[PDB]
Subunit: 311 residues, 4 copies
């Protein structure tokens, strides 16, 4: 551990937080009202070490949707219950070029971090049981990852995403055309389960616990229990490292060097292997679709604490 004095570290976290606060650029997602609602000034950062030590600053208790931030999580869950080999017969393992085809060279979604990928992954989890049951399974799972902290749902977001995601339906039908789903999959039913997962709510605080779980080889820092298999955690981290920041993934892997995953709600699930989990949140996104204050913060954290993968 490179964090000898937590107290001092925390003091630095608040300095970075304050430094980022001055970054007012970016635009709040507004393709649906449930996202337009949010104030551009909300800005929260929560830390949770592998030690179990916590620290928050800013709006770390205001609920918000995981959206794309859930992709790493449901993928981790799939590997946990099905293993690397099986999950990857349906989804790739690397970033794509850039326009934006749904499938790769082998008629499989490039990776679990893109829509097509997350949709296929969603179709692997808890096959057989009905949607209601599948959703409880993932919720219970997310609860263990967060050590029983805040994990809600947003029905308004769910209804808006469903009655608006024409591109996800396009992807749904295309994958069904290319036989990308396991035998006998209710494609439309899957997209529904998919929209629901994107609607799960968390707070910087509860999310940081989930990130810390991934930073602690699958053991929840605040309960000590094994939630995800070592295999599942290593895969999730690798993929977050290469494709978790949309079109910014390259720049991010080169300059920040940490496993992260952004969401349109403005959140950024950050993981510092064997050190801590983190969740930055600020609604204003840049052109790439990442939280402006969040990206700023991440670069600052790595310059200051030499947390970069290769330091």
């Amino acid at each position: 551990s490179m964090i000898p004095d937590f107290m001092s570290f925390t003091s630095h976290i608040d300095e970075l937080y304050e430094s980022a606060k001055k970054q007012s650029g970016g635009k709040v997602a507004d393709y649906i009202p449930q996202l337009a609602k949010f104030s551009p000034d909300l800005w929260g950062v929560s830390v949770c070490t592998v030690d179990g030590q916590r620290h928050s600053t800013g709006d770390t208790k205001v609920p918000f949707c995981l959206q794309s931030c859930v992709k790493p999580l449901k993928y981790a869950i799939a590997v946990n219950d099905l293993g690397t080999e099986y999950v990857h017969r349906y989804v790739g393992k690397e970033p794509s070029g850039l326009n934006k085809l749904f499938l790769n060279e082998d008629d499989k979604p490039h990776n679990p971090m893109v829509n097509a990928g997350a949709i296929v992954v969603t179709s692997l989890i808890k096959q057989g049981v009905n949607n209601a049951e599948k959703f409880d399974y993932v919720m219970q799972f997310l609860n263990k990852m967060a050590g029983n902290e805040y994990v809600g749902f947003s029905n308004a977001t769910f209804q808006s995403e469903r009655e608006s995601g024409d591109r996800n339906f396009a992807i749904g039908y295309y994958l069904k055309e290319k036989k990308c789903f396991p035998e006998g999959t209710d494609m439309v039913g899957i997209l529904d389960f998919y929209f629901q997962l994107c609607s799960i709510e968390v707070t910087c605080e509860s999310a940081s616990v989930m990130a810390a779980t991934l930073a602690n080889g699958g053991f929840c820092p605040i309960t000590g229990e094994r939630v995800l298999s070592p295999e599942a955690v290593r895969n999730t981290l690798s993929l977050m490292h290469s494709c978790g920041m949309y079109d910014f993934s390259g720049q991010f892997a080169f300059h920040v060097g940490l496993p992260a995953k952004s969401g349109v709600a403005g959140g950024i699930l950050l993981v510092v292997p064997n050190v801590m989990g983190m969740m930055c949140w600020s609604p204003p996104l840049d052109k790439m679709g990442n939280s402006v204050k969040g990206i700023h913060f991440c670069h600052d954290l790595v310059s200051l604490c030499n947390f970069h993968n290769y330091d």
Copy 2:
């Protein structure tokens, strides 16, 4: 007219027909039973001059679905009722590269001869009225083009295409995502109208009359009536010339030089400007998706009668 002696010409048509008959290669489409049914040995060629003169050989009275062969026709109808400018605010005017994106540089289907294009075009025809009425409108229209000859429908084909076209639905949703349809379009309703049009039935004989209509500047050779506007006919011919033979369009424009349009049913709508209309039909298709006997025939017709656009 390069056909001084119709009698002799006909004798040559039968020779080419017999020559093509020996081409047994190709595979009959079988993605649906209604197409698998067909015998690979069916082979028919019907001619209809701008003069009104007719001639058939082979299975020219066995009904079969137009399928893609209807694309040029419904496009002609759109230009006829809306004019070049309007129709092309929604669909392109040239062939694409090759994989196979749904939209081009300007978020419009490349041309009316590809699925995405034909789907958008379908959404322009007779806007407002219900589907049943739209279908009668096109049927009545196709009747005038065929001079009241055989124009049927295949409900079995229609039902199979609908409960099987996942890729067309994918295209449907994608176009709806990119705002490619006119304001307030029932996308799913349009795909239904689209599947129905693909299910319209004709015979080499009735189809050749439709082709002759396009070969006669919009006037049906056997009734003398104006069916399509000059503007509409010129557009349809240009596009059939550059993108009517799927991936073979280039080779076809270079070696045959005639406006044509193939269909998965094995038909090839051929037009020899100011001379005649033609419909070759033979279920076995090659890798490109064109009738094997039909392609052979077309090359032979141009070598023998110097009908190539630039002879």
Copy 3:
């Protein structure tokens, strides 16, 4: 012939010429001084019917480089001496998608109308003999096409194109890498021959005679002699129809419907099959790289005289 009264037709040509004259937009090519020199106001149109009848208006006697306009010509020459089959073992027969790869699916230049294509074609003509001799062979050939009218050379242009064409050298080496040239080809020597051909000079008047030759099935309208084989002329026309106006080829084939070929010098070699040959010239080019006044003129000519391929 749709030109009953040449006198009246000529009167219309001058009206279109005057109408186009008002189009002052576009920018004169300036990648080399020999092209920057030209006045944006130069504008000439020369007609030469299959009959042998002539007519000029504007700056039809000011020499200018063929540049890309020579591509159709040297291609015609290759087919004439080697036949379709041989020439096309090295170059494609259709337009490409759009970035801009040097080779297609089969490691062959897409068509003779693009740089890579024209370079490969250049390597087929008069193999064996030295460059000086090859150049005389093509010059003598171009002379017959122009009926002995103006055909010059521009050494200043040649020297500038050679000491500046890094992209053509890149293409040269790439093709050499993919074994695109006939056995034992001096690649660098070929690029030199290529640059020279681009530097050949003509005038609207002499060029229109060359165009008329292609419009007359290979027979020079003003000498009556056979210059190009029927086979060679049909191929050249087909390719000019689909890929002779750079990225505008699609729009041009759909709206104008005539075999044409533009050049960076501002010229447009136009052919109206079995009617006449033409050469419009005006240095200012549009974004696509075609003569602004020339494009305007071509659209006007087709609207007024219904010369479109499918009228």
Copy 4:
């Protein structure tokens, strides 16, 4: 350090070495004789810890060309003398899609690990001085990285690469066309310097010392001296992680999780951050172009010692 007992670790290295030895597949590069020469049975593995501890097994003293393995090294050198900002005004920082364009969206080579990238990087090192001097500069540099161990040159390889690299010349001219080189660069001279660098020779033993240098934050394990800046080492490692195994980079980052770089000579420069440097060598390559025995070994090393970046 996860290597408590070096003795035991070494015993495991020899077991993996022996296990890999049984992998006889792959084909020895043969585009030039200097590579065809090599026996498919040569197989060597050399380790060099950050501690300075060494260990070899197999043909670890047979000289071979770095080839692509030098790309990470000359890139490290550029960052060391010019800093991240400057070097990256000319070359990208991420993997590309897949065909294989020379430049990316911003007209810059995708990254330093691809030919176009390595060529641009080569043009940044020691600008001004002549080629002979530039080469000595890099040689002296490579010597410090190897702690003065074997670093040779192969004139036969150099001469063959130069008189055979048409694709590198194509790339050279294209980059020169797009103004990718610093002001006043002798492009052809640069390609020469480039071919020379690819011809530098090493042995598993000396190379492993170079890898260990990168594994030790820029300090040569066997001399203790600072050779590369921390900044330069972190960049080199990140890029080796994402694009050092050609088309296998994705699979490699996901399954092995270590910074590596392969070469057509059959070598694989491997780095285990803060632990050791390594060089596996075996001439037979797979379709991707990586050493077959080397790839096998790398997967085995990570399964056995949990060296994967995220374990």
